[PDB]
Symmetry: C2
Subunit: 330 residues, 2 copies
Amino acid sequence: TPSPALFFNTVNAYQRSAAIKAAVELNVFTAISQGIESSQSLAQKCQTSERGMRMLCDYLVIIGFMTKQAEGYRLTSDSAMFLDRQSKFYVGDAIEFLLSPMITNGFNDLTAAVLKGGTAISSEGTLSPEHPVWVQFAKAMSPMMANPAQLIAQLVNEIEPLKVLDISASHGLFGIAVAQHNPNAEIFGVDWASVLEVAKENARIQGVASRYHTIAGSAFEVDYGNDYDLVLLPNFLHHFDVATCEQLLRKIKTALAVEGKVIVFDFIPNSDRITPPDAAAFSLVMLATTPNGDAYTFAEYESMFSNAGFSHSQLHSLPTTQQQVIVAYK
Amino acid sequence: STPSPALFFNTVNAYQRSAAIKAAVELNVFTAISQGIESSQSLAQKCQTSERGMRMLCDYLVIIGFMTKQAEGYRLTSDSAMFLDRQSKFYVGDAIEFLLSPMITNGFNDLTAAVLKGGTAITLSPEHPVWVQFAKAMSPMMANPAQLIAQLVNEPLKVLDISASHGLFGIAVAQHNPNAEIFGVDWASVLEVAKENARIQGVASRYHTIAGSAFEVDYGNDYDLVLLPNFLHHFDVATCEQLLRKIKTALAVEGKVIVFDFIPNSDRITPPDAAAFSLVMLATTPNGDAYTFAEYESMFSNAGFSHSQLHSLPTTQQQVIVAYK
Ligand SMILES: [Cl-]
Ligand SMILES: [Cl-]
């Protein structure tokens, strides 16, 4: 039988976002933790009205974050692991970036973006110089990037760099992990100055500050230097049109040493542009927030590297992690 | 088995799905595809948008399940062909005029404040104009329930329809009962949608209106049937009880009240759409709720009614209570 349920669930999907934002901001999951709490008790613990807590928690049960037992609400394993502040795997503060109005405003008029072919946000959306949303990204999103940074590092350890450039270093964890596994590596991070403050702090925390160097400014304007064994591009290229990525890849080529390598870490959808769903859905994010950005397929990236003068590019799917890697060879 | 933050991240970004379906309806994408197959280039030309914008939106709409992507272009699912193509008799797309009204989405923009307060941080203002939008935009999905309730009651009647809105509940009683006289109660501006619908359905000579607040106007007397579609949920129990006392007075000796509303099981988590409606009440009203049958039963009892009885109606989304004077 045919049904308008998808339509209506989709129309009202914004409510789920608001519900999880409230839950996180109010520490609801931390208050429940691995036990069972009534809404009356969560009201006391989180300092809210009881009826408000009850209506929120019933909804959180309805959409899958918790269960409702006789004696109260209980987290699912996933909420206990990822949303309870007591857990080492807590990612709940990612909303500081993901639900930043600096990001969500692009979706306030997606019709406008579809009409014009890119972000309806004033200027160049999130690509304006030193946009503060990238400080929020660097602070808020680093927990989920820790593991892939380590994976890329141990994929690099099969190569041995002495000189590393990390372009849009952000939190700095990709270059920092290279430094962690390679005692003779010197790391150069390129980002806006206020973002590199985070990267530096993370290098400090990780014990590699003395081998961590910064080149503040636009990846397109700064002088990188040269003789780089390894150039990392984590979650950068998707923001720009193809010509701009090509401009960047030529600059990178000049800076590489003889046997130099570029590692791209990004959302790389299959050629269908609909799978994997999370990778492929990122193209709407690029429409909403950037003028000409896209979630580019491997074939598209292979062609950019080919046109920028590289000899060979190769996909490493990395099934253990959400995003995908391309290694290019000078 | 293996734990995942996927539910968390997909819930966090869920607002994006609402944005995409809003753009698609506003741009008339589903009407442009219809029951055929159209490339993103063709659709950009038909809808007067950029090619890349259309491609990116359509790929996203394929991902979340509204259409498929074939070799030669995009193709609707049956559900989209049925409900989102304007050419279909069952088109419901313009429901977003109410559902994505700022007058509802603003409430969720400060849901955290609502939870702390116990009620809306910002609909029940005298003559709020979002109710003219509800009446125009939400009527297509109420057409079938209205016919079912008219089926359920139908055996010279005097009917009161309280918060008549689009007027379809009362109108359907008159559609099926040619000697029924209908008295719609809502704000004057909302009643003009009701009257337009009365006329369209050919029942206008037997459609009458009492303009103003359901809580202040004078209903008259000797009502066989009183309809309460989608209204009690906005108010607290005491305010509901007040209205039901006022209703009781207006009823003839063997008079019945029919409530059509979101009535969740006593778990307050099923059925999912009924149960989740209480968050919408938190976000948008000071003291509204999705009340359960026990709660409505108690309200009618305290208001002096002899009896109330549930009719789930599984052939629809919402549930029905009949109360007896
Ligand atoms: Cl990153
Ligand atoms: Cl209604």
